[PDB]
Design an enzyme around this catalytic site. Structure first.
Site, PDB file in Angstrom:
ATOM      1  N   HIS A   1       0.833  -1.195   0.000  1.00 55.65           N
ATOM      2  CA  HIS A   1       0.000   0.000   0.000  1.00 55.65           C
ATOM      3  C   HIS A   1       0.879   1.260   0.000  1.00 55.65           C
ATOM      4  O   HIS A   1       0.332   2.308  -0.333  1.00 55.65           O
ATOM      5  CB  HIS A   1      -1.001   0.043   1.154  1.00 55.65           C
ATOM      6  CG  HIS A   1      -0.507   0.497   2.484  1.00 55.65           C
ATOM      7  ND1 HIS A   1      -0.096  -0.374   3.471  1.00 55.65           N
ATOM      8  CD2 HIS A   1      -0.370   1.731   3.018  1.00 55.65           C
ATOM      9  CE1 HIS A   1       0.286   0.309   4.542  1.00 55.65           C
ATOM     10  NE2 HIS A   1       0.133   1.598   4.280  1.00 55.65           N
TER      11      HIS A   1
ATOM     12  N   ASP B   1      -0.452  -7.475   1.880  1.00 53.79           N
ATOM     13  CA  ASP B   1       0.060  -6.109   1.797  1.00 53.79           C
ATOM     14  C   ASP B   1       1.583  -6.136   1.895  1.00 53.79           C
ATOM     15  O   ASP B   1       2.161  -5.873   2.941  1.00 53.79           O
ATOM     16  CB  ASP B   1      -0.543  -5.249   2.889  1.00 53.79           C
ATOM     17  CG  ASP B   1      -0.242  -3.767   2.796  1.00 53.79           C
ATOM     18  OD1 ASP B   1       0.332  -3.289   1.796  1.00 53.79           O
ATOM     19  OD2 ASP B   1      -0.575  -3.031   3.758  1.00 53.79           O
TER      20      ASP B   1
ATOM     21  N   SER C   1       3.740   2.847   8.205  1.00 53.14           N
ATOM     22  CA  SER C   1       3.453   1.910   7.138  1.00 53.14           C
ATOM     23  C   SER C   1       4.712   1.422   6.439  1.00 53.14           C
ATOM     24  O   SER C   1       5.571   2.224   6.105  1.00 53.14           O
ATOM     25  CB  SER C   1       2.576   2.543   6.042  1.00 53.14           C
ATOM     26  OG  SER C   1       1.228   2.608   6.445  1.00 53.14           O
TER      27      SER C   1
END
Ligand SMILES: N=C(N)c1ccc(CNC(=O)[C@@H]2CCCN2C(=O)CCC2CCCC2)cc1
Ligand code: NA
Ligand code: NA
Lengths: 10, 249, 27
Positions: free
Chosen positions: B43, B99, B197
């Site tokens: 992502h 992911d 992230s």
């Protein structure tokens, strides 16, 4: 806000 | 990272910063798994709902950093991307299943006291350490609150039982994900947040005292909310794709 | 291979300030 890096890295 | 502490120097030498060239900004976390491969969240590179689709040439890999904004002369190394590899079944439409992504570097980076690869788990290490209650460690330069840190932040967090993960959210949780964090009644708190992230969730194996990357910072509902947990990509569950990608390219 | 061993900690036999909290959770 970020110190700039050697131009060489872009 | 929220309710974390400053990192010690050299504490996370596999820590990588994904850096946008223009406007120069932090994009995400990531990790060094070899002298030319960087692991991150899919992502971080591709997320069409937010019109995100970065190409190699949009990115730089900054390794060995401590300071978030500073150019760390003689310490950090900065690398260019040769090629981005996103998991062919990454589910951006729905739940960020799978992911995970790889980045190959144009040139190998030089290891140093501040730059060193993390291990990727094997089945036995995963089976031995991915247990509810066992703590892992999450690191990043993301937000401190749901402002920004001066240096890399660190937080240790307990893996949470799968039913508690599932019952904490309306999202459909998969076997490719695990969640971590303290429960409301546990007193302690802490979480990953925006900016974190793609960074690593690592554990130190008590069998051979090496650090293993068990997860990747993937998603959360707010940051450090009571009754909510951070969700991490399960790296061992996707290692075949990883190995294949590295084995082929 | 030499992965997971930090030059400034494991390779020097120094411990960081909170790694013991991880060990103690491992059972
Ligand atoms: N609290 C956490 N552990 C945490 C970790 C990572 C993030 C950032 N990731 C994201 O922003 C991802 C990708 C887009 C939608 N999504 C979410 O988390 C929203 C649910 C947000 C929160
Ligand atoms: Na649920
Ligand atoms: Na929480």
């Amino acid at each position: 806000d970020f110190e700039e890096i050697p131009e060489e890295y872009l | 990272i929220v309710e974390g502490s400053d990192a010690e120097i050299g504490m996370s030498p596999w820590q990588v910063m994904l850096f946008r060239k223009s406007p120069q900004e932090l994009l995400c976390g990531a990790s060094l798994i070899s002298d030319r491969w960087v692991l991150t969240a899919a992502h971080c590179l591709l997320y069409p709902p937010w019109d995100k689709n970065f190409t190699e040439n949009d990115l730089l890999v900054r390794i060995g950093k401590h300071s978030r904004t500073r150019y760390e002369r003689n310490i950090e190394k900065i690398s260019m991307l040769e090629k981005i590899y996103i998991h062919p079944r990454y589910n951006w439409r729905e739940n960020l299943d799978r992911d995970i992504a790889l980045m190959k570097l144009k040139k190998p980076v030089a290891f140093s006291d501040y730059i060193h690869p993390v291990c990727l788990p094997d089945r036995e290490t995963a089976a031995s350490l991915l247990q509810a209650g066992y703590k892992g460690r999450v690191t990043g330069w993301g937000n401190l609150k749901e402002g920004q840190p001066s240096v890399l932040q660190v937080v240790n967090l307990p893996i949470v039982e799968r039913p508690v993960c599932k019952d904490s959210t309306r999202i459909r949780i998969t076997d490719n994900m695990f969640c971590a964090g303290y429960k409301p009644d546990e007193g302690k708190r802490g979480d990953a947040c925006e900016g974190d992230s793609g960074g690593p969730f690592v554990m130190k194996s008590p069998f051979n005292n090496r650090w293993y990357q068990m997860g990747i910072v993937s998603w959360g509902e707010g940051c450090d909310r009571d009754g909510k947990y951070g969700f991490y990509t399960h790296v061992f569950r996707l290692k075949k794709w990883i190995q294949k990608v590295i084995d082929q390219f | 291979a030499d992965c997971g061993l930090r030059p400034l900690f494991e390779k020097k036999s120094l411990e960081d300030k909170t790694e013991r909290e991880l060990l103690e959770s491992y059972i």
